[PDB]
Enzyme design. Structure first.
Site, PDB file in Angstrom:
ATOM      1  N   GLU A  35       0.822  -1.213   0.000  1.00 20.30           N
ATOM      2  CA  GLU A  35       0.000   0.000   0.000  1.00 20.30           C
ATOM      3  C   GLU A  35       0.855   1.262   0.000  1.00 20.30           C
ATOM      4  OE1 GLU A  35      -3.042   0.293  -0.511  1.00 20.30           O
ATOM      5  OE2 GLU A  35      -4.005  -1.613   0.033  1.00 20.30           O
ATOM      6  N   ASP A  48     -12.810   8.486  -7.789  1.00 17.92           N
ATOM      7  CA  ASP A  48     -14.029   9.122  -7.301  1.00 17.92           C
ATOM      8  C   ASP A  48     -13.772  10.432  -6.570  1.00 17.92           C
ATOM      9  OD1 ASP A  48     -13.026   8.362  -4.872  1.00 17.92           O
ATOM     10  OD2 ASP A  48     -14.794   7.199  -4.253  1.00 17.92           O
ATOM     11  N   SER A  50     -11.939  10.718  -3.763  1.00 23.58           N
ATOM     12  CA  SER A  50     -11.435  10.463  -2.430  1.00 23.58           C
ATOM     13  C   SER A  50      -9.921  10.255  -2.484  1.00 23.58           C
ATOM     14  CB  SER A  50     -12.156   9.277  -1.816  1.00 23.58           C
ATOM     15  OG  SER A  50     -11.863   8.118  -2.538  1.00 23.58           O
ATOM     16  N   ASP A  52      -6.479   8.272  -0.344  1.00 25.60           N
ATOM     17  CA  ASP A  52      -5.981   7.279   0.602  1.00 25.60           C
ATOM     18  C   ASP A  52      -4.743   7.793   1.316  1.00 25.60           C
ATOM     19  OD1 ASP A  52      -7.813   5.565  -0.823  1.00 25.60           O
ATOM     20  OD2 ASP A  52      -6.256   5.461  -2.352  1.00 25.60           O
ATOM     21  N   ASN A  59      -8.954   5.275   3.247  1.00 22.59           N
ATOM     22  CA  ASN A  59      -9.583   6.190   2.299  1.00 22.59           C
ATOM     23  C   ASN A  59     -10.605   7.118   2.945  1.00 22.59           C
ATOM     24  OD1 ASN A  59     -12.541   5.451   1.857  1.00 22.59           O
ATOM     25  ND2 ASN A  59     -11.515   3.459   1.767  1.00 22.59           N
TER      26      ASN A  59
END
Ligand SMILES: [Cl-]
Ligand SMILES: [Cl-]
Ligand SMILES: [Cl-]
Ligand SMILES: [Cl-]
Ligand code: NA
Ligand code: NA
Length: 129
Positions: A35, A48, A50, A52, A59
């Site tokens: 990640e 979208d 958003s 992270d 998120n």
């Protein structure tokens, strides 16, 4: 902060992630590697709108407030910037809520695609814990 592999494993262990909801420590280390490359200051935008945040790429659509994700929730009740701290407490405590939300660690796409079904214990091999 960029953690070493065993340094992160030990921090995660002390914060209670080892076998949390049945996920052994190597699962969490593997997820963090793919990640964020173990970097607490990692950020990444989603299609979208958003974003992270942090070592586990939590998120803003559901879990934290960044002030710029319209129609989102803040279920960990924290500013997203708290997830970028060198102190991983907020990331770990929010991750415990996420992993308990019914889908387990499948909530982290990278875990499902890169860690699930592999020998995740290798991620903690050699570490003093
Ligand atoms: Cl590594
Ligand atoms: Cl496991
Ligand atoms: Cl810490
Ligand atoms: Cl599960
Ligand atoms: Na393990
Ligand atoms: Na939000």
């Amino acid at each position: 902060k960029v953690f070493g592999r065993c340094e992160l494993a030990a921090a995660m262990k002390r914060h209670g992630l080892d076998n949390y909801r049945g996920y052994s420590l190597g699962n969490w280390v593997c997820a963090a590697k793919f990640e964020s490359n173990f970097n607490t200051q990692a950020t990444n935008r989603n299609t979208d709108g958003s974003t992270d945040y942090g070592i586990l790429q939590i998120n803003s659509r559901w879990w934290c407030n960044d002030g710029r994700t319209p129609g989102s929730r803040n279920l960990c009740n924290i500013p997203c910037s708290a997830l970028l701290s060198s102190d991983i407490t907020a990331s770990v405590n929010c991750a415990k809520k996420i992993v308990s939300d019914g889908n387990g660690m499948n909530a982290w796409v990278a875990w499902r695609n890169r860690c699930k079904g592999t020998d995740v214990q290798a991620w903690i091999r050699g570490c003093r814990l």
